[PDB]
Structure 1
Amino acid sequence: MQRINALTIAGTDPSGGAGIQADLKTFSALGAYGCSVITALVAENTCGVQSVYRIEPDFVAAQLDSVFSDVRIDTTKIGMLAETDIVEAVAERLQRHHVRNVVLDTVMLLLSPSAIETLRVRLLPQVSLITPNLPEAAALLDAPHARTEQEMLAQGRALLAMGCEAVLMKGDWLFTREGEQRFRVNTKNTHGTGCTLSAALAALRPRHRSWGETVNEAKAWLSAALAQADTLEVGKGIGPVHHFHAWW
């Protein structure tokens, strides 16, 4: 297989189940060399977040430069952005280096109205695939939570018009200019699922013909990771999936 370098721009999880830790494990497990720009540090746990430590947007930019000025990046996954200046810094470097295959996860359960505003205007026109759930989609569109399937489909299409090449609305429906495509969990250890799925979609995209195929393989792989989550021995709270279920 051809060599693919994948980059993750996100926050950290010391317990190793989410954040760039999860992104990097996923890249690794799916045959991609991993790079990582840290946007924020967090003392995180399997029992929750203890505290967040912010990083100067300027150093995030410096990190972005160290990577893009030296390593060819074939796919990129974006997680926690934290604030307006970070969003701007990321969007700016993405544009400058013509970064393709950008998968944007929607970590905003939080971001200021200013940060969100910047995200939709500066970042969205640069993402290949965005992966929000219902609450996040409404927030990105500043619209009411989708009540029915039609409203949900309308939001998916609205996000495309905003610049996204594709949208994966998590209930799952995949949106593309072409049309829509429709897509269980038996474990409580689901910590980092969101980070992992978006990382998987990023790592696998270059190995497929379309988003439909990569979305299909990504979900199959994730289900397998969740199906092995209980065999791990980490934490007293909600454990992480098992990224290396296929290896050990």
Structure 2
Amino acid sequence: GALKKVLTIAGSDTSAGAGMQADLKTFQELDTYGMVALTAIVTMDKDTWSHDVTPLPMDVFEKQLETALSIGPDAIKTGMLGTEEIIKRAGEVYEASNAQYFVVDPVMVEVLNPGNTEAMIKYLLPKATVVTPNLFEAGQLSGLGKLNSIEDMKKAATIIFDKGAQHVIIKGGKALDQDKSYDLYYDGQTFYQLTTDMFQQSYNHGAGCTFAAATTAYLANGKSPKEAVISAKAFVASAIKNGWKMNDFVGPVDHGAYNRIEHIDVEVTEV
């Protein structure tokens, strides 16, 4: 078959563990044709690792979208998007396209811009095939605030699904539990808990981007949403376990570890 065309709308992580770098690397690992519409460029100070986010002008953002839409993506992912304007356009781009899958990683950084959260709820959730919040982001999107348990994650997932997302996976992460990694997946009918072990020498920069990018490529290549999130969780678990130390401040996931090194078991249960 021809390679599936998979677009990410995301920024450049110059360190190359997260951002569009994670997305293109993951798309490559999963035998898709990766494409990116760049939103911003993120750099890091050599001594302190302080981040500098340089937005790209809207005119060049729009030129890239014209090109990507002409090529015709089969699936679109959104990464961290910085403005309500870009959030709104990302949704519009997916609706204009013939893409069948839209995966939204609702990256946020009390939230820094609650305006962006409101924009995600308005413009992206109603279009999303899968939305992939971490525990914090899920509390923001659902309006519940802080989530502390699987039962709280069930409530938030219901609310997010009701806002229009077709499938919701909330990543518990270290915020939920420091010995096991628990995610709550909801399809409108059934709550599934997905669990992987955690490992001592792991590194996690780019994990969220990688998970969402793998989900997108798995969907594009024909996995059901359930199968895609379960396979994506195994994919990123391997990446995290095999992450490596970049400097005193960070270490990226190994995007290629699933294929090159090992698979990690994912336990699936109904909750």
Please report the TM-score for the alignment, with normalisation by the length of structure 1: 0.90
CA shift for structure 1 position 207: 3.0
Indicate the residue corresponding to 2:266 in structure 1.
none
In structure 2, the partner of 1:177 is 188
Deviation of 1:135 (Å): 1.2
Shift of 1:212: 1.5
Structure 2 CA distance for partners of 1:98 and 1:163, relative to 1, 3 Å: farther
Secondary structure at the aligned position of 1:10 is classed as: strand
Q: Name the counterpart of 1:224.
A: 238
SS of aligned partner of 2:9: strand
Change (3 A) 1:76 1:41: same
- 1:173 match: secondary structure: strand
Runs of 4+ aligned structure 1 residues displaced above 3 Å come to: 44-49, 233-236
Check conservation: 2:7, 2:35, Cα contact below 8 A: yes
* Residues 223 and 115 (structure 1), Cα distance of their counterparts in 2 relative to 1, 3 Å cut: closer
Q: Does 1:244 align with 2:245?
A: no
User: Is contact 1:129–1:165 with CA below 8 Å preserved after alignment?
Assistant: yes
Aligned position for 1:30: 30
Give matches, 1:1-248, under 5 Å: 2-44=2-44, 48-69=49-70, 71-109=71-109, 112-171=113-172, 172-183=183-194, 184-186=197-199, 187-230=201-244, 234-245=246-257, 246-247=259-260
- Distance, in Å, in 1 between the alignment partners of 2:80 and 2:228 is 23
Provide closer, same or farther for how the CA distance between residues 22 and 150 of structure 1 changes in structure 2, counting only shifts above 3 A.
same
Distance 1:114 1:50, change over 3 A: closer
Residue identity over aligned pairs, in percent, reads: 31
Counterparts in 2 of 1:145 and 1:62: CA distance versus 1, 3 Å: same
| Counterpart code for 2:100 | R
Specify whether residues 247 and 146 from structure 1 end up closer, same or farther in structure 2 by C-alpha distance, changes over 3 A only.
Answer: closer
Q: Contact 1:102/1:202 (CA < 8 Å) preserved in 2? A: yes
C-alpha offsets along residues 121-157 of structure 1, whole Å, 9 cap, x if unaligned? 1121111100112211111223221244333211101
> Structure 1 residues 44 and 20 mapped into 2: Cα distance closer, same or farther (>3 Å)?
farther
Offset at residue 247 of structure 1 (A): 4.2
Aligned equivalents of 2:77, 2:49: Cα separation in 1: 23
Deviates more, 1:187-196 or 1:12-21: 187-196
How much does 1:48 deviate?
4.0
Equivalent pair of 1:17/1:192 in contact (CA under 8 Å): yes
Pair 1:50–1:209, CA change in 2 (3 A)? closer
Amino acid at match of 2:251: G
In 1, Cα distance between equivalents of 2:235 and 2:145? 33
User: 1:20 and 1:165 mapped to 2: Cα distance?
Assistant: 24
Match of 2:265 in 1: none
Whole-Å separation in 1 of the counterparts to 2:127 and 2:50 = 30
* One-letter amino acid of the counterpart of residue 202, structure 1: T
Which whole-Å CA distance do the structure 2 matches of 1:147 and 1:7 have between them? 34
CA contact (8 A) 1:103 1:202 kept: yes
TM norm structure 2: 0.83
| 8 Å contact from structure 1 (residues 82, 111) kept in 2 | no
Please report how far the alpha carbon of residue 240 of structure 1 lies from its aligned counterpart in structure 2 after TM superposition.
0.8
Report how many aligned residue pairs link the two structures.
245
Flag the structure with more relative contact order, 1 or 2, with Cα contacts below 8 A and sequence separation at least 6.
1
CA 15–209 in structure 1, closer or farther in 2 if over 3 Å, else same = closer
Deviation at 1:237, TM superposition (A): 2.8
Question: C-alpha separation between the residues in 2 aligned to 1:243 and 1:189?
Answer: 11
Q: In structure 1, what is the equivalent of residue 178 of structure 2?
A: none
Give, as a single letter, the amino acid of the residue that structure 2 aligns with 1:241.
V
Q: Let me know the Cα RMSD of the aligned residues.
A: 2.1
